[PDB]
Design a protein around this ligand. Structure first.
Ligand SMILES: *C(=C)C1=C(C)[C@@H](Cc2[nH]c(/C=C3N=C(/C=C4\NC(=O)[C@H](C)[C@H]4CC)C(C)=C\3CCC(=O)O)c(CCC(=O)O)c2C)NC1=O
Ligand SMILES: *C(=C)C1=C(C)[C@@H](Cc2[nH]c(/C=C3N=C(/C=C4\NC(=O)[C@H](C)[C@H]4CC)C(C)=C\3CCC(=O)O)c(CCC(=O)O)c2C)NC1=O
Ligand SMILES: *[C@H](C)[C@H]1/C(=C/C2=NC(=C\c3[nH]c(C[C@H]4NC(=O)C(C=C)=C4C)c(C)c3CCC(=O)O)/C(CCC(=O)O)=C2C)NC(=O)[C@@H]1C
Ligand SMILES: *[C@H](C)[C@H]1/C(=C/C2=NC(=C\c3[nH]c(C[C@H]4NC(=O)C(C=C)=C4C)c(C)c3CCC(=O)O)/C(CCC(=O)O)=C2C)NC(=O)[C@@H]1C
Ligand SMILES: C=CC1=C(C)[C@@H](Cc2[nH]c(/C=C3N=C(/C=C4\NC(=O)[C@H](C)[C@H]4CC)C(C)=C\3CCC(=O)O)c(CCC(=O)O)c2C)NC1=O
Ligand SMILES: C=CC1=C(C)[C@@H](Cc2[nH]c(/C=C3N=C(/C=C4\NC(=O)[C@H](C)[C@H]4CC)C(C)=C\3CCC(=O)O)c(CCC(=O)O)c2C)NC1=O
Ligand SMILES: C=CC1=C(C)[C@@H](Cc2[nH]c(/C=C3N=C(/C=C4\NC(=O)[C@H](C)[C@H]4CC)C(C)=C\3CCC(=O)O)c(CCC(=O)O)c2C)NC1=O
Ligand SMILES: C=CC1=C(C)[C@@H](Cc2[nH]c(/C=C3N=C(/C=C4\NC(=O)[C@H](C)[C@H]4CC)C(C)=C\3CCC(=O)O)c(CCC(=O)O)c2C)NC1=O
Ligand SMILES: C=CC1=C(C)[C@@H](Cc2[nH]c(/C=C3N=C(/C=C4\NC(=O)[C@H](C)[C@H]4CC)C(C)=C\3CCC(=O)O)c(CCC(=O)O)c2C)NC1=O
Ligand SMILES: C=CC1=C(C)[C@@H](Cc2[nH]c(/C=C3N=C(/C=C4\NC(=O)[C@H](C)[C@H]4CC)C(C)=C\3CCC(=O)O)c(CCC(=O)O)c2C)NC1=O
Ligand SMILES: C=CC1=C(C)[C@@H](Cc2[nH]c(/C=C3N=C(/C=C4\NC(=O)[C@H](C)[C@H]4CC)C(C)=C\3CCC(=O)O)c(CCC(=O)O)c2C)NC1=O
Ligand SMILES: C=CC1=C(C)[C@@H](Cc2[nH]c(/C=C3N=C(/C=C4\NC(=O)[C@H](C)[C@H]4CC)C(C)=C\3CCC(=O)O)c(CCC(=O)O)c2C)NC1=O
Ligand SMILES: C=CC1=C(C)[C@@H](Cc2[nH]c(/C=C3N=C(/C=C4\NC(=O)[C@H](C)[C@H]4CC)C(C)=C\3CCC(=O)O)c(CCC(=O)O)c2C)NC1=O
Ligand SMILES: C=CC1=C(C)[C@@H](Cc2[nH]c(/C=C3N=C(/C=C4\NC(=O)[C@H](C)[C@H]4CC)C(C)=C\3CCC(=O)O)c(CCC(=O)O)c2C)NC1=O
Lengths: 164, 248, 177, 177, 164, 177, 164
């Protein structure tokens, strides 16, 4: 779990020393910024069924061929599977917004995604299209405060970069 | 043994938390969690391969050595699995001179330099008697490996301070370059080929290039040449009330 | 390993449940005393060496058989190893106090320690005494109740943190039992 | 390695001088734009893959001899190897921008790189072109001047940071020359 | 140099990844607390010839034997050397209060102090007496604000522990 | 490595000559003072720590620039290492004195030392001074000429051993020059 | 270069022994089968501008969307680049049919293909469509003898499997 605390205590463990004030300073950094980053969590927590709604259909509209025979979206419950599979990524960005680091994302959704998406022939461009849809769908002032929108987008484009 | 630059001008070494969990009643070691294990393997790749810029087509063949490693935390067996792979041999055994491969093993798996000609001879005899895997097994199961790194840390270039011989220090710095220095600059042609068999030392500039930051590297060089003259017989006197005596 | 925020995340993942506003009172209250926990951890790590030196000496105080020939703490080598182990237990309980979770204690320090001590012949009761002195020494520093060693703090109650660190020392004590 | 605060400390240590109030305008002003630097670094690292993929393609654009047989970037191995390098240099200049000092750039990445490229036969001019393309789009992202990729920021001038990162790319360009 | 930035960027280097927001959070922690920790910067800088004044003489008073023949303080300029040698530690706590971590102290004054203080027969108890003198010579209301005194003392007792 | 008996053996092997009675006056005389050499080596190793601590302090005595900031012996780390260098030299010259041959010095000491000091920036002249202080007090102890430190011996002349150990220190001094 | 001789010479080098008859036996295996393997060398060499002709257009027909704006085939000379980029794979299968092993293919076209095809956003499904087109576009009796057709197909589906 890549978190602000797990970095500093693992460093202290490797050096074999007690936590110094340079370590405590980072948790102070958490103390300030949780309030801004926790606001986005609740926003995504409640409104999560609507964002996957708009994201999956945007994915399928941008690549209409994917419903053709022999492609990933050839029947019904595969489309339902797709919508589930983006629901998972929304869940993981919520978890990462809570922990403070990219801990949950890079070991539960990113780690090993490349095998599943290549052997099951799932184009990653379709995932990144749906994610980039929500990246700009959001307007920072109305939906959230100013700084929750920054950090939500910073977590979203993290996995955008990771999948590309 | 003081390491005036081991843990203050250089970071601490990296590896498994501790060997007590190896005693294993319910688990073999505290699940370092997958996110503090991928950086361990990233660290090992940067060491045993030494910045070889390995693509993922070539990291699709080290899957089996990795998959056992995260399951059973011995580091030493992980590097034993790595050094016998085609990824290790194709880079370090294929295009290279013999003592080049032998000397690269000291950099990769032991983190020091060969201290003498007889060590190289012993490795050569040990290779000739049936394989190179015997070379790696001798190094890895060595005493020196147990009392330096063990089954917990990545093998790293440790500044010991209390070297058994000084040329060991020189030849540690020449094999270890700077960062963004790899091991296919020369096409074979080991750097210590001449200096091991002859007994002289290495270039001062290339040793100074590998020193850590803030160590007044390179300075103090008199402008005349650097290698000493074995045949010199200088007279240096002491100081006595009556005169000077050349107690030689 | 885990911390307080990664606790609830894995608990909710077992339900496939989002972390909603109902579960965030625990964490938002965890953030309320954030400065309190930081004010406590440096107070403890600020006296780290004295606490260990006092603890092993107190161990020896009512068990003089450990000095005796054949004692587990007889020679200077043993006086050195047992004095380390004070640093290791104390460092790991400080890590756990800082993270707000003991998920680092019994995987990375306490995992397999009882068997290691059994093989080495380390007496358990005396080690438990050493741990309980350090524990009684911990709460004293967190609550600013030490006889000397006046530390400047902000006024309030740190009693919950005192119970937390006592619970952490408890599981060290019970792990080797 | 060093950072902005550890710069002045070693400079004053050469004089055996305390760090007094006269030398702390530079650092206290460094802390003034602290949020600016953080607002800049994620903007850069947020487009890391696209910047590299654009940079090597731009390299190839006006030097089609690199694709040709015998070109240094001929086969897929060499594209892959070259592709790494665009991102790796970018990571170190991002580290240097974050620390406010290029002490972790010319001591962890650029030390001995010219000789490594000379031994490997890597063309210098094309690599310098790749670095400059990356430089220009670094400033484009810091100043929010990119044609697309509208990023929300706080209003003000980040020009000093733009100059800083340009100077960092400069020393990469001059290190391999 | 053990600093708040050097921890996180070294961790990112070891993991081979870009700086994430979990990393930036620690530098935010610096952003808050530099003001408190650099307020003591003047206090040590402009007042330093007086603190070594009171510290060295307290050291020599607490252990009067040290001036006896055959001890460390047997002539004059060795006493001057002692006062210099505590001046160095004051200069290093100032540096550490500036960098944010224990970087300067544990590699310039602590690293290797052992052998030097044993082979030259210098009792470490004398060093720790002088340092503990200044640790409680400090007053919270008069000397600094409230929080500078905490962190100055936290740096002082750092070396008061290592020397022990 | 070699000793006094293994000296003549390799010298005669270059001639394919047996070691006859003509060559054994040198060795049989070497055995005559055997107790003298043993009486000398413990006298030297008996004061090993004091000799080194006196030597580096004497070094510093007339070169106060080594303490100064930027000096090679500035911080406690560097005193510690420089303290370590004195013991390594003294131990090896004691080995050579014991074996009666310096075949252990320049293969496992001087051999590859000058370059190590050049790369590290160690000043040669001050180190030569440290070696010569150690040399002078080596002869002082062998000849029982030290101002204090009265050691009981057997009456006779150890002057030849004094010249031997002086010659050994000479080649340390000339190896790093 | 993964060849029949390369494996035997390298194994003997690793064991540090002279070439035995078990080694010579493999080169005998080469002696038989080169004639069948190199009969297709004519067929690929003299007929190659036609196979890329039929393969690239089949690729673009099976995925018509990729000519759309923002996709890989958005202008002209990118289509020419696509045709070149399949010409390269035909060249490499010819080289592999000559050496006897998959030496040239897995180090000149396969090694590292995954970085270029993701960061430049090139769908591998398009490559495998064009290659599978030529895999069954061959009928053995008219085109070749019986055994050249199997070994050509065995080399083709090698990289089909590698890209998938
Ligand atoms: C060959 C003839 C040739 C190319 C291949 C191509 C490469 C190239 N692109 C630029 C200019 C920019 N690159 C930018 C990068 C991105 N835009 C995005 O939206 C994403 C986030 C990112 C990667 C896709 C941008 C924004 C620009 C505009 C200029 C700028 O810096 O903002 C160049 C010019 C290099 C320079 O001087 O900046 C090149 C070579 N262009 C080609 O001509
Ligand atoms: C700086 C100006 C300065 C010093 C520091 C100090 C160092 C020094 N000492 C000598 C001379 C001797 N050192 C001796 C060593 C010892 N005496 C003991 O009783 C114990 C066993 C041991 C270590 C404490 C002795 C015996 C002497 C007398 C001369 C001798 O060799 O016997 C020197 C001169 C070096 C030389 O030429 O011998 C120096 C620099 N003296 C300082 O002047
Ligand atoms: C010499 C006493 C040693 C030895 C030294 C090594 N030199 C190495 C590389 C190297 N040296 C030079 C300088 C020299 N070679 C030249 O061709 C010319 C001018 C025409 C000069 C002045 C160069 C240019 C290079 C790099 C190219 C090369 O590989 O030769 C070297 C390799 C490691 C290093 O980079 O230093 C060594 C070990 N080698 C010996 O065999 C004797 C004992
Ligand atoms: C003290 C009188 C000297 C001096 C000594 C320093 N040496 C430093 C590092 C160092 N020294 C050696 C040589 C030593 N090691 C050996 O193994 C042997 C013989 C077997 C000897 C003589 C080595 C090899 C090293 C580097 C080892 C390492 O640390 O990795 C040193 C460190 C300075 C620093 O970098 O901070 C010092 C001060 N320096 C002096 O000025 C006087 C002359
Ligand atoms: C938990 C995280 C979270 C978000 C970020 C938002 C994201 C979001 N916004 C909207 C819906 C909307 N979102 C915006 C925001 C904007 N429109 C713009 O043109 C600007 C670029 C931008 C800032 C003004 C607006 C104006 C609407 C109204 C409908 C629309 O504009 O299309 C919708 C569809 C349902 C709805 O209309 O509310 C969603 C999922 N909702 C969430 O639950
Ligand atoms: C040489 C032979 C050889 C093997 C067969 C595998 C066997 C194997 N599988 C796993 C490890 C695993 N193996 C599986 C596989 C499965 N889980 C299921 O439910 C399915 C039945 C099955 C897939 C079809 C999974 C899911 C994990 C990892 C699970 C986890 O811990 O997250 C590990 C642990 C390695 C590690 O990660 O450290 C090993 C050794 N490895 C080998 O070296
Ligand atoms: C892969 C290719 C390969 C080689 C060719 C050899 C080359 C070689 N020979 C020797 C080492 C030697 N080589 C010879 C050989 C000879 N001396 C002569 O006068 C004759 C001309 C010749 C025999 C015909 C001798 C006599 C020694 C050792 C001499 C000694 O030091 O005692 C060494 C040193 C190895 C060591 O002992 O550490 C090496 C690398 N080794 C290899 O790995
Ligand atoms: C018979 C053998 C014997 C000893 C060797 C000593 C050791 C010792 N000291 C304390 C007791 C204590 N130990 C300390 C510790 C310290 N005080 C300071 O000023 C320093 C910062 C720090 C290390 C010196 C404090 C403050 C107490 C008082 C009780 C407490 O505060 O916990 C205790 C009781 C443990 C407890 O319940 O707390 C023991 C056994 N006492 C003994 O009875
Ligand atoms: C990460 C967590 C961690 C620990 C807790 C320690 C636990 C531990 N202690 C010892 C080893 C030892 N531990 C002790 C300690 C004690 N003996 C007593 O009677 C007292 C109860 C106690 C001191 C208070 C002693 C005395 C030895 C060595 C005894 C000997 O063999 O001479 C060893 C053996 C290591 C070795 O030497 O090879 C280990 C693993 N180490 C760790 O890595
Ligand atoms: C980076 C290092 C770092 C720290 C050391 C702490 C330092 C610290 N502690 C507190 C603040 C406090 N600290 C305490 C603690 C106590 N008060 C008492 O009288 C008890 C003896 C003791 C219980 C342990 C209390 C009660 C507060 C105020 C409540 C609160 O801030 O939550 C505060 C906020 C208000 C203040 O400045 O005082 C800060 C910054 N925070 C940090 O970021
Ligand atoms: C931490 C610092 C660090 C770096 C900065 C890089 C530097 C670096 N690059 C390459 C390796 C390489 N570098 C490139 C890249 C390029 N050559 C060109 O023609 C282009 C101008 C450019 C692409 C933009 C190429 C093509 C190779 C491989 C060359 C070969 O096949 O030998 C290698 C060794 C190759 C290997 O081991 O596989 C190293 C060390 N790596 C590091 O460790
Ligand atoms: C942990 C991650 C982390 C971050 C990403 C930053 C996020 C961040 N940026 C700024 C704040 C700012 N950011 C900018 C930057 C810009 N404004 C522009 O219009 C330019 C395009 C761009 C130049 C690069 C400016 C000008 C301010 C206000 C000045 C300042 O705060 O110093 C602020 C303070 C005020 C605000 O909330 O906006 C914060 C928290 N800080 C952090 O702690
Ligand atoms: C195992 C450890 C071990 C030793 C330490 C020596 C101890 C030792 N030294 C000498 C013996 C001696 N030692 C000396 C030396 C001296 N006399 C002086 O007055 C000078 C100051 C000093 C010169 C260095 C002399 C001159 C003799 C007698 C001559 C001789 O025995 O060769 C003898 C033989 C006679 C005697 O017992 O004294 C022995 C056993 N031998 C050992 O086996
Ligand atoms: C080197 C590899 C290689 C191949 C795989 C083939 C592929 C191929 N086939 C045809 C062209 C042709 N190929 C055939 C053959 C057949 N059509 C069928 O319906 C039957 C299945 C099959 C029996 C053998 C026919 C009838 C034509 C003319 C019509 C057409 O274009 O398919 C052409 C155009 C030039 C030519 O006629 O050869 C090419 C390149 N040729 C090659 O040189």
């Amino acid at each position: 779990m890549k978190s602000v605390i797990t970095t500093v205590v693992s460093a202290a463990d490797a050096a074999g020393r007690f936590p110094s004030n340079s370590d405590l300073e980072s948790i102070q950094g958490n103390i300030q910024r949780s309030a801004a980053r926790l606001e986005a969590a609740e926003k995504l927590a409640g409104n999560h069924e609507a964002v996957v709604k708009e994201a999956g259909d945007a994915c399928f509209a941008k690549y209409a061929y994917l419903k053709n025979p022999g492609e990933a979206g050839e029947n019904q419950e595969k489309i339902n599977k797709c919508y589930r599979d983006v629901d998972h990524y929304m869940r993981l960005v919520n978890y990462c917004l809570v922990v403070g680091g990219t801990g949950p994302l890079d070991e539960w959704g990113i780690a090993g995604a490349r095998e599943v998406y290549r052997t099951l022939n799932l184009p990653t461009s379709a995932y990144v299209a749906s994610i980039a849809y929500t990246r700009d769908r959001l307007c920072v002032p109305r939906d959230m405060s100013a700084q929750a929108g920054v950090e939500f987008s910073a977590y979203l484009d993290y996995l955008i970069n990771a999948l590309s | 043994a003081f390491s005036s630059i081991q843990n203050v001008l250089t970071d601490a070494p990296l590896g498994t938390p501790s060997a007590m969990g190896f005693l294993d009643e319910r688990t073999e070691k505290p699940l370092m969690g997958p996110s503090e294990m991928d950086e361990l393997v990233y660290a090992v790749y940067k060491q045993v391969f030494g910045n070889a810029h390995i693509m993922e087509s070539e990291r699709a063949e080290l899957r089996d050595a990795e998959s056992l490693f995260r399951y059973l935390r011995d580091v030493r067996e992980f590097v034993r699995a790595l050094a016998k792979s085609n990824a290790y041999t194709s880079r370090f055994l294929q295009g290279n001179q013999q003592y080049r491969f032998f000397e690269l093993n000291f950099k990769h798996l032991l983190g020091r330099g060969p201290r003498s000609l007889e060590e190289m001879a012993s490795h050569s005899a040990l290779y000739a008697e049936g394989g190179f895997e015997a070379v790696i097994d001798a190094i890895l199961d060595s005493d020196e490996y147990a009392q330096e790194f063990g089954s917990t840390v990545v093998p790293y270039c440790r500044f010991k301070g209390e070297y058994p011989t000084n040329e060991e220090f020189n030849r540690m710095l020449v094999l270890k370059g700077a960062n963004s220095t790899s091991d296919k600059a020369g096409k074979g042609r080991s750097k210590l080929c001449y200096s091991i068999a002859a007994g002289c030392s290495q270039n001062w500039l290339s040793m100074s290039k590998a020193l850590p930051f803030g160590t007044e590297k390179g300075t103090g060089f008199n402008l005349i040449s650097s290698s000493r003259n074995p045949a010199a017989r200088p007279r240096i006197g002491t100081k006595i009330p009556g005169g000077v005596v050349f107690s030689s | 390993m885990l911390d307080a925020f990664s606790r609830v995340v894995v608990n909710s993942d077992a339900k496939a449940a989002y972390v909603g506003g109902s579960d965030l009172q625990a964490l938002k209250s965890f953030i309320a005393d954030g400065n309190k926990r930081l004010d406590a951890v440096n107070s403890i790590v600020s006296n780290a060496s004295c606490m260990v030196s006092d603890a092993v000496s107190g161990m020896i105080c009512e068990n003089p058989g450990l000095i005796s020939p054949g004692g587990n703490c007889y020679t200077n080598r043993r006086m050195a190893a047992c004095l380390r182990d004070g640093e290791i237990i104390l460092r790991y309980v400080s890590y756990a106090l800082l993270a707000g979770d003991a998920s680092v204690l019994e995987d990375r320090c306490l995992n397999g320690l009882k068997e290691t001590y059994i093989a080495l012949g380390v007496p358990t009761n005396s080690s438990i005494r050493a741990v309980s002195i350090m524990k009684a020494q911990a709460v004293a520093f967190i609550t600013n109740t030490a006889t000397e060693r006046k530390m400047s703090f902000a006024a309030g109650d740190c009693t919950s943190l005192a119970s937390e660190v006592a619970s952490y020392f408890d599981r060290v004590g019970a792990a080797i039992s």
